[PDB]
Amino acid sequence: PAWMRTLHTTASNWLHLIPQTLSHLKRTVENIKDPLFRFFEREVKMGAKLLQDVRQDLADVVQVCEGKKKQTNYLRTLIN
Amino acid sequence: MALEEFLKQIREVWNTYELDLVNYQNKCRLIRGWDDLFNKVKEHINSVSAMKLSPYYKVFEEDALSWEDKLNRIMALFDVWIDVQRRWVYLEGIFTGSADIKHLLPVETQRFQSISTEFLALMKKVSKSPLVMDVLNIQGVQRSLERLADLLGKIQKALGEYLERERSSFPRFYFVGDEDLLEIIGNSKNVAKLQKHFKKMFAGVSSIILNEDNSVVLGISSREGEEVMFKTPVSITEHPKINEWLTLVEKEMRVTLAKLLAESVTEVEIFGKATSIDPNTYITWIDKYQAQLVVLSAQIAWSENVETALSSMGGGGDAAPLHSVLSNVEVTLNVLADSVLMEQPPLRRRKLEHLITELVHQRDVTRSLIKSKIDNAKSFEWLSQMRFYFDPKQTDVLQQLSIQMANAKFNYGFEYLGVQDKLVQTPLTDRCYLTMTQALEARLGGSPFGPAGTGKTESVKALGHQLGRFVLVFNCDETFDFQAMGRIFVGLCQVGAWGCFDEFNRLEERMLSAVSQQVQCIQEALREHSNPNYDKTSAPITCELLNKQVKVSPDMAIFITMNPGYAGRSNLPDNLKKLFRSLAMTKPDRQLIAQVMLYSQGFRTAEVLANKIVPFFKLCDEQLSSQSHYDFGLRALKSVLVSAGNVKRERIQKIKREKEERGEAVDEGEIAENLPEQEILIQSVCETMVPKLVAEDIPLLFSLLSDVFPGVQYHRGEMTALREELKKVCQEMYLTYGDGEEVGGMWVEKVLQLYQITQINHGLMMVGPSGSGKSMAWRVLLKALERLEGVEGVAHIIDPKAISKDHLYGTLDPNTREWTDGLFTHVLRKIIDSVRGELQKRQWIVFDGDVDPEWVENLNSVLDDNKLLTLPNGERLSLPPNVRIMFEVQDLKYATLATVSRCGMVWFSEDVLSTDMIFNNFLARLRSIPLDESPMLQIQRDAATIMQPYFTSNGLVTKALEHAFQLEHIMDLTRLRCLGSLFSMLHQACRNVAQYNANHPDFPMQIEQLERYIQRYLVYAILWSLSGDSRLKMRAELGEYIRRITTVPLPTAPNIPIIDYEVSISGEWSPWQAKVPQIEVETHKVAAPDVVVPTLDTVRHEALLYTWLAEHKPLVLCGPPGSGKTMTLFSALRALPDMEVVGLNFSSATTPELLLKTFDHYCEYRRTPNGVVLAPVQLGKWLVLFCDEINLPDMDKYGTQRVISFIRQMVEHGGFYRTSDQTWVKLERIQFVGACNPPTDPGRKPLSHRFLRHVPVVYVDYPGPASLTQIYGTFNRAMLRLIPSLRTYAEPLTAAMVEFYTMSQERFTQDTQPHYIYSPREMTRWVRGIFEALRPLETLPVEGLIRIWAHEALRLFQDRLVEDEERRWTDENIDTVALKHFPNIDREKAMSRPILYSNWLSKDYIPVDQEELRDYVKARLKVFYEEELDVPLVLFNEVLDHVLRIDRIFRQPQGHLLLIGVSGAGKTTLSRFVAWMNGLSVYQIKVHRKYTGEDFDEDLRTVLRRSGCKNEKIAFIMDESNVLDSGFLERMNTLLANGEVPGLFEGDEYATLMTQCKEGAQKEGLMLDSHEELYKWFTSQVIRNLHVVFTMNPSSEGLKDRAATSPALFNRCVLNWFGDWS
Amino acid sequence: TSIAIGSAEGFNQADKAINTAVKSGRWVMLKNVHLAPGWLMQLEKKLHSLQPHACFRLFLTMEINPKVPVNLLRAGRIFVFEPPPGVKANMLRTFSSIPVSRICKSPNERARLYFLLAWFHAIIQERLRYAPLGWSKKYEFGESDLRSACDTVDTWLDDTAKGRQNISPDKIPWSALKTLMAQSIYGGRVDNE
Ligand SMILES: Nc1ncnc2c1ncn2[C@@H]1O[C@H](COP(=O)(O)OP(=O)(O)OP(=O)(O)O)[C@@H](O)[C@H]1O
Ligand SMILES: Nc1ncnc2c1ncn2[C@@H]1O[C@H](COP(=O)(O)OP(=O)(O)O)[C@@H](O)[C@H]1O
Ligand SMILES: Nc1ncnc2c1ncn2[C@@H]1O[C@H](COP(=O)(O)OP(=O)(O)O)[C@@H](O)[C@H]1O
Ligand SMILES: Nc1ncnc2c1ncn2[C@@H]1O[C@H](COP(=O)(O)OP(=O)(O)O)[C@@H](O)[C@H]1O
Ligand SMILES: [Mg+2]
Ligand SMILES: [Mg+2]
């Protein structure tokens, strides 16, 4: 379909822009005492989690746009 | 032998026990001493059970059993008598003390005299013989008491008009419910029962003080014991009327406070204008006067001193006596601080803290005045402050004190407030005071707005308490309508009280506009009250409220509180907002609050502590992980500061005790100096904030504690006494206990954290994932506290979302304005009344369920410091100190900040409940609890030993479980669902061994045999419990991984997966294929609904369901529609004869009512000593509730399905509550089976994890092509036995049928159209259609067989198509499939495009020519016009096809039609024509503008009666326009699927229907007498005599909506897409 | 006769008031009628088949909500009430709303204070148009704030000036007006530092 092909290009192009890796900060006995590390560990943890979700969602979207996987209730809402 | 003596002791007690009778006004001898009577019965009942435990119970069993019957009767009789006697007491005082009621209400005054005369008769009989057993032996005494109770309720309910009039006499009665008001009026003579009601009518008066005659009121008392002695005592003898002397008491209360204030002002003038103050003199003054008076007098003295000083500086160049005012405040504050440092009586301590709070504010104000160089008393920097002026020369004592702020002047109301917790006067508080007082001067309301926990509600009360006003807090919701809010205004206006309405935007917008008229009308009365022209000697100011003239007191005020940032809240109309003055309170001055609170509590380093504790809360908010259950606001800071004072007091008491027991040297100064205030604050912080923290945040907070508070460590106390109690309780409850790092130490720590939170907060939340040990924690704690403190613990568990909000809190009748209690309201009110000693017990109300703002925001004032349950009828219920409100939840993603802030939080994690402890609990129960109710227990013990090596840390089960979470399941996988599935199956294995031993009494199973069976069974159980909700590939995956890890012998097949093997009782593996044979079905049973062709998947699922169903464990069948879920359960239920199954068809609109309607039909409610028990009417039968669309019910905006919560409550707790009497009902012999499609399907929602924990799920996928060949090749082989010439074509015919079904299923999917569902149901209909045509046919050439095969396929796969392209595909693909599997046949003869079949031109169903069919229909249509409907119709080819399709379904049992097409296409007319042709009677409902659901039920009853009792074939034609509500489709859905509506016939309608069914069955010649067989015959008749034709337009979104609203419309109805004319 | 829409009893009052007024010629005002779109369709039908008194008037106050029936909008004459377009329009509306006899009281300085009141009010609302820069959010600075401001000026001017014809500007309670306006009248709605 027209929108099915249109969403495929956008999802694939979007996957190119977004990065792929983001490693969590490492806990250390003296790192905890640093407030800067205390704040930054939350930043990467939120970033790495959200990065994994969005990319996986787009991945599923491209899979639907190629017909490899069936549409689900959440996937229908996300694609809509 | 000691059993006999205990029986003799109990016999002697009851033969000597007599009812303690005391005279009541020389009218009767009322029963006294209920508590001793009830306790003795309870003690003997528990003893009666103990003797049964011993094996010697048998010799005295009959006598013991006869005894327990008598005590139960005693308990039953006296559980009503106490209610009857109490009801009669206050009803007697109303019909006798008052004279106006006899003229006003004469009819039931005589009714009361009749029942009363019966009561005195009964009482005199009890008097003659006061023996308890003799009273029990009175004939019909139980029935008589219940009749007395029922009648007294009717008279009591019929006193509403009298109560409304009495409220006008004494205005404060408007804040007392009807139940308590009757008690107050009736018990006017005996004042001792009035003491518990004064708290509801006064701000700080909890009890009154009387002389020893109880005839003169000497004064009042508060809940803290503070007393005010009246200067003029009120004598009740002179004013016998209750409303008369209550007014005098209220009037005297104000006067005596004003006169005491004048005395205190004169006394405090000495402390003012004094350079040095003696602490002993100041302390004596403080103790002499009440708490609110000492603060007021200090306020007056400071105000006059500043006014005097500013007058001296009025010349400008004069000196500065303002410094003398500052020094006097500082000198007084130093004495105040010194007094707090030393120990003080609790009442004097609270007075000192209030005085400290006031003088800190005075010092700050005076310093500001000096810093501003103020020299004039008329400067606004002094006038903007709140100043207190006293005029002793004024004759009116109530007018001697004036409160002024800016231009606003107020008179002290002199309402006694007791000892209220004062607020720190922050700059935001001053801005609030300035703005609210300006609103009061403008005769306008106040609207402090902002986020939660900013001090808005307390600010209104604090200002009202400062003016001596009675402030009433109302927690408003959507039920606060025009009438309820208007009645609240009437009470406030007449009393002269402040009404603070918090969450006032929770009202409906239409209601908000409506109340603006009343607020505006009230303010105009207030505005005209303030004009000097008005004189109080004239007519008092009245306003128009609820069509009544209501007096308005000048002390009345209205304040509203809202959070305008909450999404989903009503927007106030502008004409309402202009009636109020709004102020933003967003950033409370926490630092000043913390500093003043710690300074008043006795901390020397308060300033350092405050500067450390306020940033720490900010640090925790921004450095800890963001969790929805985290709150670090002012309310959290308020709790820790209060607990810090409590801890410091406890520590000081501890050090003094240590000094006392170690020598004799005690000094307050030494202890205060050498006291670790840093550790006290840290301990308070951790005790409140640690339990809510997640595991990752615990080091995070303890690290932050090191930077802000270096050097101080938290060492939690070792609660040795409580831990021992916990260990004993856990041992008896089969729960694992550990200390610290042992298995279960984290869970024990969570329980201890829960205990600590109970002591600080009255509101608690256990938050954690499903199966985290939350419920087991508080159950064990409740028992342990019972065994330790000796206080009996009672737990009331409520599922708030399993019922409606009306049923949870109560409903106000819009017509009669009568209040009925809800579930939570009834429990709370019963505890408050404490008729059966509920206040001496620990009452816990656990809200186990989902939390959303709609229902829990009603508890805001309950969980605040107000501790009030406000109801829309003006009633306020106080939370007793022994009651805890608990919320056991799995998430808080929908709760708001208001709810989270008000509750203490304990966070539970899946880590807290280690898999090891679950294994230990299962094994401990197996070794202890026999499975019969022991040889079985012995088998269980040997079995438990065998599985012990596998139920270990990182054991086979653990490793398998870990690997299982990495696979994909049709439902979300949780640990406890899988393990509960595993444990139930292992119970079956033990029951299996018992069966073998019973079947082999000579040779029972050996240990080696048991070991082999258990080992193989365990692997078999692990696979099906951990991969039953997965497809075939992951079942293979789990089997492969288990083969990699296990040491148990496994089948040695090179490629067959382990899931294809069962475990024989022989202890050896046996393939499932040995139980699935190639059976040959009879000719007359071909593709019958109850005929199942065994396959590999069928036998595996059947044996699985038998294992789960037997254990009575609820289960869920998941899979695509038509996969065989319903077929498998009924086939598995066959092996369960004692189990009776009832089918319920869930829809989007399904509520727990459908569950309740089924219960009212198939079950009965039986009252027992234990309680109300709901059990099936059939005896020795287990009712199986089969719900077909469990995941279909609608989810609200907060992710909850009400019926799913209802079922979850019914399974987890074993019962539910009856909204009729808030009575707990316990289920018996009732099991539950669920069926559903995968949650990813449209319209389906994922089931809650808490529900799924109790229900194992097995995935039933579509049979494979190999399975389809076997299931339908057998049917064809039997079907084709009718004509032997076609028997050789059985194999190719099945192949063609299998192939076309696969292509149709692959080509058309739900993506294209919502109704494009293809399943083996179509393949079953395919075989039925061919068989039905072939039955009469004596012989048929192969060409005719293909024509029938092609025809049925066109009817099953093409009739539902929407686009012509799809239909063309079906036609062509059918041509190709038939030629692919049937070569060398006459293509044209067997596949002529007009494939038409009919039984109209002959007796048999044979192919019909188009032109002959057209002529015959023309002739029939001619008769149709002259007989039924004279509407000429033009006949075209599509019409001929349609009338043949309609004729096909009308000839089928339970055949229903869904005709989809454009309006006016002929659907209704054609259906009427075919129905007339087949003899069916057309029924259509006549919808008008007033047609409601009750009309539809009556219309339905007409169809059911005619088609079920009269054996009349009826075609029920219904159009989508006939549907006016979702109620229409809910009954239609049930009727289409089951053929009967559960709640359609009730009362006399059911009685009449059974009579007609008996008459109808007699006509048929059948002998049915009982009701259940009459209904079953009635159901069978309707299923065979009713044809429902649904007609709707081809809407795109409407079709998708209907696929969930009415699932039966797409599963039980044949869909025919007429569409538009081509 | 003014009735607030939203309750079952209110509809009964509205119907009774309209029936009485169309014969007697009184004025009926129904407020927040946008909260009952269904009843509005019934009311428009009742109005169409009616021959009221010559002096009868029916005023329906409502927000600009799409739920208002179209037929009612076509049946009636629509007047839009919104912030005045500019400072001059804002000040002209204020001077029209305040009665002349109130401004022209004994102190000759009252007229100037009312003008600074109109100018302050006009500047404040016109800044609301520029949502991020003029203020931080759409504060509801409206007629209620202006009326409360006018009452406050009247109260404190009469307090300081005891019926005198002229008061020197130094004795005007500037601090009282400024503080009450920044903390209570206009500052009450302000929740931003
Ligand atoms: N300390 C323990 N030792 C052993 N078994 C335990 C312990 N605590 C709980 N269990 C068992 O583990 C399971 C946990 O159920 P429980 O009701 O305690 O969990 P929950 O967190 O309240 O669940 P939900 O959120 O689903 O209501 C139960 O079978 C219970 O008997
Ligand atoms: N000025 C203050 N001094 C002392 N405590 C305060 C002050 N302001 C607020 N609090 C405390 O904050 C808590 C929450 O305030 P609350 O009345 O719930 O505000 P809201 O109306 O915004 O919910 C109260 O328990 C109160 O004791
Ligand atoms: N082994 C089998 N033997 C006989 N019929 C089967 C078998 N497997 C599937 N079927 C057919 O599949 C259909 C399943 O329909 P149903 O029980 O309503 O499934 P669900 O409950 O999943 O919707 C039945 O009509 C049945 O004839
Ligand atoms: N085959 C037909 N020939 C002539 N008139 C028809 C035909 N089908 C429907 N009609 C017209 O439709 C009217 C009846 O409406 P109906 O077709 O029953 O509505 P619906 O198709 O929505 O059920 C009749 O007045 C009749 O004139
Ligand atoms: Mg509040
Ligand atoms: Mg639980």
mmCIF file of C-alpha atoms in Angstrom, chain C:
data_model
loop_
_atom_site.group_PDB
_atom_site.id
_atom_site.type_symbol
_atom_site.label_atom_id
_atom_site.label_comp_id
_atom_site.label_asym_id
_atom_site.label_seq_id
_atom_site.Cartn_x
_atom_site.Cartn_y
_atom_site.Cartn_z
ATOM 1 C CA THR C 1 -35.019 36.053 36.711
ATOM 2 C CA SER C 2 -31.546 34.501 36.505
ATOM 3 C CA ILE C 3 -31.112 30.717 36.617
ATOM 4 C CA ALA C 4 -27.921 28.642 36.536
ATOM 5 C CA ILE C 5 -28.209 25.558 34.329
ATOM 6 C CA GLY C 6 -27.040 22.146 35.484
ATOM 7 C CA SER C 7 -29.552 20.621 37.904
ATOM 8 C CA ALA C 8 -32.879 18.888 37.358
ATOM 9 C CA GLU C 9 -34.572 21.516 39.527
ATOM 10 C CA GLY C 10 -32.954 24.241 37.417
ATOM 11 C CA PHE C 11 -34.658 23.060 34.230
ATOM 12 C CA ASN C 12 -37.995 23.217 36.055
ATOM 13 C CA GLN C 13 -37.230 26.788 37.135
ATOM 14 C CA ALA C 14 -36.087 27.706 33.621
ATOM 15 C CA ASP C 15 -39.284 26.370 32.045
ATOM 16 C CA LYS C 16 -41.470 28.073 34.657
ATOM 17 C CA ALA C 17 -39.608 31.389 34.403
ATOM 18 C CA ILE C 18 -39.818 31.430 30.597
ATOM 19 C CA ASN C 19 -43.538 30.607 30.667
ATOM 20 C CA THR C 20 -44.245 33.406 33.152
ATOM 21 C CA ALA C 21 -42.040 35.962 31.384
ATOM 22 C CA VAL C 22 -43.451 35.536 27.862
ATOM 23 C CA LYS C 23 -46.817 36.652 29.281
ATOM 24 C CA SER C 24 -45.632 39.329 31.730
ATOM 25 C CA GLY C 25 -42.733 40.736 29.695
ATOM 26 C CA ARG C 26 -39.952 40.166 32.254
ATOM 27 C CA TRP C 27 -36.322 39.221 31.396
ATOM 28 C CA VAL C 28 -34.991 35.647 31.904
ATOM 29 C CA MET C 29 -31.219 34.901 31.886
ATOM 30 C CA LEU C 30 -29.991 31.259 31.700
ATOM 31 C CA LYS C 31 -26.237 30.862 32.434
ATOM 32 C CA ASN C 32 -23.745 28.137 31.329
ATOM 33 C CA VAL C 33 -26.327 26.698 28.918
ATOM 34 C CA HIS C 34 -23.471 24.971 27.070
ATOM 35 C CA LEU C 35 -23.535 22.301 29.803
ATOM 36 C CA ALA C 36 -26.928 20.978 28.597
ATOM 37 C CA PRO C 37 -26.736 20.627 24.799
ATOM 38 C CA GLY C 38 -29.716 18.267 24.773
ATOM 39 C CA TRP C 39 -31.973 20.647 26.690
ATOM 40 C CA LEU C 40 -30.850 23.446 24.361
ATOM 41 C CA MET C 41 -32.407 21.671 21.369
ATOM 42 C CA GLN C 42 -35.700 21.410 23.266
ATOM 43 C CA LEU C 43 -35.548 25.086 24.258
ATOM 44 C CA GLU C 44 -34.970 26.300 20.691
ATOM 45 C CA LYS C 45 -38.034 24.345 19.556
ATOM 46 C CA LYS C 46 -40.092 25.877 22.375
ATOM 47 C CA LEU C 47 -38.916 29.382 21.456
ATOM 48 C CA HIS C 48 -39.797 29.003 17.767
ATOM 49 C CA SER C 49 -43.462 28.133 18.398
ATOM 50 C CA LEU C 50 -44.081 30.991 20.801
ATOM 51 C CA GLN C 51 -45.520 34.523 20.718
ATOM 52 C CA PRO C 52 -44.055 36.233 23.795
ATOM 53 C CA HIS C 53 -44.774 39.673 25.208
ATOM 54 C CA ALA C 54 -43.306 42.698 23.443
ATOM 55 C CA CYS C 55 -40.879 43.459 26.293
ATOM 56 C CA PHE C 56 -39.858 39.826 26.863
ATOM 57 C CA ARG C 57 -36.152 39.086 26.483
ATOM 58 C CA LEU C 58 -34.270 35.811 26.942
ATOM 59 C CA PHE C 59 -30.488 36.027 27.482
ATOM 60 C CA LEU C 60 -28.489 32.770 27.229
ATOM 61 C CA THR C 61 -24.908 32.997 28.596
ATOM 62 C CA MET C 62 -22.553 30.200 27.469
ATOM 63 C CA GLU C 63 -18.883 29.513 26.569
ATOM 64 C CA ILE C 64 -17.840 29.167 22.875
ATOM 65 C CA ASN C 65 -18.291 25.336 22.873
ATOM 66 C CA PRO C 66 -18.895 23.195 19.704
ATOM 67 C CA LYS C 67 -21.527 21.245 21.669
ATOM 68 C CA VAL C 68 -23.938 24.192 21.386
ATOM 69 C CA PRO C 69 -26.627 23.198 18.842
ATOM 70 C CA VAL C 70 -26.426 24.921 15.470
ATOM 71 C CA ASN C 71 -30.181 25.562 15.325
ATOM 72 C CA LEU C 72 -30.026 27.554 18.566
ATOM 73 C CA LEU C 73 -27.181 29.641 17.131
ATOM 74 C CA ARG C 74 -29.240 30.361 14.008
ATOM 75 C CA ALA C 75 -32.360 31.126 16.061
ATOM 76 C CA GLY C 76 -30.630 33.671 18.308
ATOM 77 C CA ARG C 77 -28.392 36.704 17.922
ATOM 78 C CA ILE C 78 -24.786 35.997 18.875
ATOM 79 C CA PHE C 79 -22.634 38.413 20.880
ATOM 80 C CA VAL C 80 -18.990 37.494 21.484
ATOM 81 C CA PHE C 81 -17.314 38.610 24.711
ATOM 82 C CA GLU C 82 -13.526 38.459 24.639
ATOM 83 C CA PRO C 83 -10.498 40.522 25.699
ATOM 84 C CA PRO C 84 -10.637 43.980 24.134
ATOM 85 C CA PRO C 85 -8.381 44.312 21.079
ATOM 86 C CA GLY C 86 -6.017 46.882 22.577
ATOM 87 C CA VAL C 87 -5.011 49.162 25.441
ATOM 88 C CA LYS C 88 -7.323 51.966 24.310
ATOM 89 C CA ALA C 89 -10.246 49.556 23.930
ATOM 90 C CA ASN C 90 -9.420 48.024 27.318
ATOM 91 C CA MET C 91 -9.404 51.414 29.049
ATOM 92 C CA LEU C 92 -12.610 52.539 27.322
ATOM 93 C CA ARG C 93 -14.395 49.376 28.471
ATOM 94 C CA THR C 94 -13.218 49.931 32.052
ATOM 95 C CA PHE C 95 -14.408 53.547 32.175
ATOM 96 C CA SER C 96 -17.778 52.485 30.754
ATOM 97 C CA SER C 97 -18.232 49.672 33.284
ATOM 98 C CA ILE C 98 -17.437 51.814 36.338
ATOM 99 C CA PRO C 99 -20.327 54.206 37.109
ATOM 100 C CA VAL C 100 -19.531 57.907 36.878
ATOM 101 C CA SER C 101 -20.911 58.670 40.346
ATOM 102 C CA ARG C 102 -18.390 56.255 41.872
ATOM 103 C CA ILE C 103 -15.377 57.940 40.254
ATOM 104 C CA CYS C 104 -16.628 61.479 40.971
ATOM 105 C CA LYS C 105 -16.684 61.276 44.758
ATOM 106 C CA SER C 106 -15.477 63.750 47.389
ATOM 107 C CA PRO C 107 -11.687 63.282 46.914
ATOM 108 C CA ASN C 108 -10.623 64.866 43.631
ATOM 109 C CA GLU C 109 -7.674 62.434 43.579
ATOM 110 C CA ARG C 110 -10.014 59.440 43.199
ATOM 111 C CA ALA C 111 -10.372 60.034 39.453
ATOM 112 C CA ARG C 112 -6.610 59.817 38.902
ATOM 113 C CA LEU C 113 -6.350 56.624 40.966
ATOM 114 C CA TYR C 114 -9.072 55.035 38.838
ATOM 115 C CA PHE C 115 -7.164 56.029 35.691
ATOM 116 C CA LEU C 116 -3.970 54.367 36.921
ATOM 117 C CA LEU C 117 -6.221 51.417 37.746
ATOM 118 C CA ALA C 118 -7.546 51.297 34.179
ATOM 119 C CA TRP C 119 -4.070 51.728 32.695
ATOM 120 C CA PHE C 120 -2.571 49.052 34.949
ATOM 121 C CA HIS C 121 -5.416 46.672 34.109
ATOM 122 C CA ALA C 122 -5.200 47.416 30.376
ATOM 123 C CA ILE C 123 -1.433 46.851 30.294
ATOM 124 C CA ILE C 124 -1.801 43.597 32.236
ATOM 125 C CA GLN C 125 -4.332 41.932 29.923
ATOM 126 C CA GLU C 126 -2.621 43.105 26.734
ATOM 127 C CA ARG C 127 0.538 41.371 27.977
ATOM 128 C CA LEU C 128 -1.478 38.144 28.233
ATOM 129 C CA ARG C 129 -1.668 37.990 24.427
ATOM 130 C CA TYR C 130 2.091 37.309 24.272
ATOM 131 C CA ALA C 131 1.892 34.138 26.331
ATOM 132 C CA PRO C 132 5.601 33.317 26.969
ATOM 133 C CA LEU C 133 6.944 36.885 27.141
ATOM 134 C CA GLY C 134 4.200 39.111 28.564
ATOM 135 C CA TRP C 135 3.590 36.545 31.306
ATOM 136 C CA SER C 136 4.494 32.897 31.831
ATOM 137 C CA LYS C 137 0.963 31.517 31.387
ATOM 138 C CA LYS C 138 -2.637 32.493 30.632
ATOM 139 C CA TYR C 139 -3.479 34.050 33.973
ATOM 140 C CA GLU C 140 -7.174 34.805 34.412
ATOM 141 C CA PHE C 141 -6.691 38.535 34.970
ATOM 142 C CA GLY C 142 -10.282 39.637 34.494
ATOM 143 C CA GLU C 143 -13.145 41.866 35.582
ATOM 144 C CA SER C 144 -13.175 40.386 39.097
ATOM 145 C CA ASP C 145 -9.615 41.601 39.686
ATOM 146 C CA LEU C 146 -10.551 45.072 38.432
ATOM 147 C CA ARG C 147 -13.678 45.230 40.608
ATOM 148 C CA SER C 148 -11.745 44.065 43.675
ATOM 149 C CA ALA C 149 -9.057 46.633 42.861
ATOM 150 C CA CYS C 150 -11.684 49.382 42.610
ATOM 151 C CA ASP C 151 -13.202 48.358 45.951
ATOM 152 C CA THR C 152 -9.770 48.340 47.603
ATOM 153 C CA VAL C 153 -8.966 51.849 46.348
ATOM 154 C CA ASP C 154 -12.355 53.136 47.512
ATOM 155 C CA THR C 155 -11.948 51.536 50.943
ATOM 156 C CA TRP C 156 -8.471 52.909 51.645
ATOM 157 C CA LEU C 157 -9.048 56.340 50.095
ATOM 158 C CA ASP C 158 -12.098 56.944 52.295
ATOM 159 C CA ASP C 159 -10.134 55.630 55.283
ATOM 160 C CA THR C 160 -7.256 58.079 54.828
ATOM 161 C CA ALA C 161 -9.400 60.963 53.518
ATOM 162 C CA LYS C 162 -12.200 61.588 56.031
ATOM 163 C CA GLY C 163 -14.605 63.138 53.552
ATOM 164 C CA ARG C 164 -12.163 65.877 52.553
ATOM 165 C CA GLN C 165 -12.416 67.402 49.092
ATOM 166 C CA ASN C 166 -8.675 67.251 48.354
ATOM 167 C CA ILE C 167 -5.881 65.000 49.617
ATOM 168 C CA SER C 168 -2.206 65.600 48.919
ATOM 169 C CA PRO C 169 -0.628 62.734 46.927
ATOM 170 C CA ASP C 170 1.851 62.064 49.749
ATOM 171 C CA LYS C 171 -0.916 60.944 52.128
ATOM 172 C CA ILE C 172 -2.443 58.493 49.625
ATOM 173 C CA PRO C 173 -1.897 54.952 50.994
ATOM 174 C CA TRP C 174 0.341 53.838 48.133
ATOM 175 C CA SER C 175 1.836 50.966 50.140
ATOM 176 C CA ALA C 176 -1.607 49.579 50.996
ATOM 177 C CA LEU C 177 -2.776 49.624 47.373
ATOM 178 C CA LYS C 178 0.494 48.221 46.015
ATOM 179 C CA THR C 179 0.825 45.415 48.566
ATOM 180 C CA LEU C 180 -2.804 44.262 48.485
ATOM 181 C CA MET C 181 -2.689 44.298 44.680
ATOM 182 C CA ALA C 182 0.574 42.349 44.415
ATOM 183 C CA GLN C 183 -0.372 39.783 47.077
ATOM 184 C CA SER C 184 -4.167 39.400 46.965
ATOM 185 C CA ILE C 185 -5.947 40.974 43.985
ATOM 186 C CA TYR C 186 -3.663 40.294 41.020
ATOM 187 C CA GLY C 187 -0.871 38.365 42.734
ATOM 188 C CA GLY C 188 -3.250 35.692 43.986
ATOM 189 C CA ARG C 189 -3.458 34.154 40.517
ATOM 190 C CA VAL C 190 0.322 34.465 40.069
ATOM 191 C CA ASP C 191 2.178 31.244 40.922
ATOM 192 C CA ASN C 192 5.548 32.155 39.371
ATOM 193 C CA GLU C 193 8.330 34.045 41.135
#
